[PDB]
């Protein structure tokens, strides 16, 4: 049901002790739009609701990232653009991603269903975690499964902000 | 005349296709205060006037990077403090810089005069470019030479904001 993962470490890009990263990734199936179901309180997303990330393939082998979100304190939709690159083999879902301005950090897919509908992604340490989905809501069952992996990999899931989405 | 360079390419640190990076860098001569003559504008400097960049040696072999500017909207001076490390040899003027946690960006000196009076520095893509100078103004001749290198390395110099300086 879930993609295979294995313990993976790269200095400066993965959390202490390593995390189980997807090891038979197919980047083409990760393209397009994902909704941010949940995030930890990442400084560079603070305040934002209805967040999405949209990935597209670049000529240089990286991905373009378009981040979109609504700031309820301003009543305005916002957008930013980043880049993503594999740090190693493209079958390992370990990348570096520009999360703000020119500053790149680790982006590690630590759970992924085999149909590329739902994903658990962590950053370079345990202050950075996302649940992503092809739909604006997920089932309680999918929520439990993603949370279970996060807990297994040492994250405190009570740090999640459950992001406002259509139908949420 | 300008320092010699060699092509350096690494995704996440240099722009696509690589850029020519100074290859006989002597970091001690790069220390101290530089005026930001021009920047491509981005989030973390928008609206800033009278910007200086200040580099100092760290005990750990890195550089402290301070970026200071006057923010008219706040009516205050502000500064961000960061840490930069060479990604390779210390004679290659390519570094990685962080101002917040485990998030780093590429800093690449792509033109440098041999007396360390002016420099052209790019980030990890072609949205990031700076002209730095030991003096708050530069001559037309120096300005044109920097613009020519920028264009040579694929940058669009119409994106420059010419920063308010004394
Ligand atoms: C990677 C390019 C090197 C840039 C060097 C100098 C340019 C001006 C300084 C940029 C300041 C960056 C501040 C980052 C903000 C940290 C998170 C936050 O407080 O929101």
Domain spans of chain B, in order of start: 1-166
Q: Which two tokens stand for residue A9?
A: 């470490």
By C-alpha distance, which of B28, B20, B14, B27 is closest to B2?
B20
- Name the residue of chain A whose CA is nearest to B43's CA: A101
Q: Which residues of B touch A85 (CB under 8 A)?
A: 11-12
- Cα distance between residue B127 and residue A12, in whole Å: 25
CA distances to A108, B48, B121, B159 from B128, rounded to whole Å, are 26, 16, 8, 10
Q: Residue ranges of the alpha helices (H) in chain A?
A: 140-152
- Cα distance between residue A34 and residue A107, in whole Å: 15
Handedness of CA B104, B110, B116, B118 (dihedral sign): negative
What is the CATH code of the structural domain delimited by B1-166?
A: 2.40.128.20
CA distances to A13, A26, A59, B161 from A87, rounded to whole Å, are 9, 15, 17, 33
What is the nearest CA distance from A137 to chain B, expressed in angstroms?
A: 30
Other beta carbons within 10 angstroms of residue B122's beta carbon come to 26
User: Determination technique for this PDB entry?
Assistant: X-ray
Other beta carbons within 10 angstroms of residue A7's beta carbon come to 12
Burial string for B40-69 (b: 16+ CB within 10 Å, else e) reads beeeebeebebbbbbbeeeeeebbebebbb
Other beta carbons within 10 angstroms of residue B144's beta carbon come to 10
Pocket lining: B100 vs ligand 1, CB cutoff 6 Å: yes
Mutation target for B interface from A60, A90, A98, A101: give the one with most B CBs within 10 A. A101
The region that residue B13 occupies, defined by phi over 0 for left and psi between -120 and 50 for alpha, beta otherwise, is alpha
Q: Do B12 and A104 touch (CB under 8 A)?
A: yes
Question: Do B145 and B120 touch, CB atoms closer than 8 A?
Answer: no
Question: Do B65 and B56 touch, CB atoms closer than 8 A?
Answer: no
- Cα distance between residue B104 and residue A106, in whole Å: 10
The pick from B35, B46, B65, B82 for probing ligand 1's pocket by mutation, whose C-beta has the most ligand atoms within 8 angstroms, reads: B82
Question: Do A94 and A84 touch, CB atoms closer than 8 A?
Answer: no
Resolution, rounded to a tenth of an Å? 1.8
- Cα distance between residue A161 and residue A164, in whole Å: 9
What is the CATH code of the structural domain delimited by A1-168?
A: 2.40.128.20
Q: Which two tokens stand for residue B10?
A: 């690494």
Q: Which residues are CB-neighbours of B28 under 8 A, at least 6 positions away?
A: B57
Q: Do A62 and B11 touch (CB under 8 A)?
A: yes
Which of B17, B43, B125 lies nearest to residue A83, judging by beta carbons?
Answer: B125
Pocket lining: B97 vs ligand 1, CB cutoff 6 Å: yes
SS3 per-residue string spanning chain B: CECCEEEECCECCECCCCEEEECCCCHHHHCEEEEEEEEECCHHHCCCEEEEEEEEECCCCCEEEEEEEEECCCCEEEEEEEEEEECCCCCCCEEEEECCCCCEEEEEEEEEECCCCEEEEECCCCCCEEEEECCCCCCHHHHHHHHHHHHHCCCCHHHEEECCCC
Residue nearest to atom 6 of ligand 1 (CA): B67
- Cα distance between residue A59 and residue A110, in whole Å: 26
Q: Which two tokens stand for residue A62?
A: 């990286």
Other beta carbons within 10 angstroms of residue B101's beta carbon come to 15
Q: Do B125 and A103 touch (CB under 8 A)?
A: no
- Cα distance between residue A92 and residue A107, in whole Å: 11
- Our CA angle for B83, A61, A39, nearest 5°, is 60
Q: Which residues are CB-neighbours of B20 under 8 A, at least 6 positions away?
A: B5, B6, B7, B8, B110, B149, B152, B153
The pick from B99, B101, B102, B104 for probing ligand 1's pocket by mutation, whose C-beta has the most ligand atoms within 8 angstroms, reads: B99
- Cα distance between residue A67 and residue A163, in whole Å: 14
State the count of interchain CB pairs (< 8 A) between A and B: 54
A81 half-sphere exposure, CB direction, 13 A CA radius: 6
Q: Name the interface residues of A facing B (CB cutoff 8 Å).
A: 12, 43, 60-62, 83, 85, 96, 98-106, 123-125, 127
């Amino acid at each position: 049901h879930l993609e295979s993962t294995s313990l993976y470490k790269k200095a400066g890009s993965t959390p202490p002790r390593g995390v189980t990263v997807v090891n038979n990734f197919d980047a083409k199936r990760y393209l397009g739009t994902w909704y941010e179901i949940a995030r930890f309180d990442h400084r560079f997303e603070r305040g934002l609701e209805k967040v999405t990330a949209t990935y597209s393939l670049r000529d240089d082998g990286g991905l373009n990232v378009i981040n979109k979100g609504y700031n309820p304190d301003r009543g305005m939709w916002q957008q930013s653009e980043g880049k993503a690159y594999f740090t190693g083999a493209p079958t390992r879902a370990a990348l570096k991603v520009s999360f703000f301005g020119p500053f790149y950090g680790g982006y590690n897919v630590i759970a992924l269903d085999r149909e590329y509908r739902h994903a658990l992604v962590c950053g370079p340490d345990r202050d950075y975690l996302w649940i992503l989905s092809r739909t604006p809501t997920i089932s309680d069952e999918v929520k439990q499964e993603m949370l279970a992996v996060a807990t297994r990999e040492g994250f405190d899931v009570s740090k999640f902000i459950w992001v406002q989405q259509p139908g949420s």
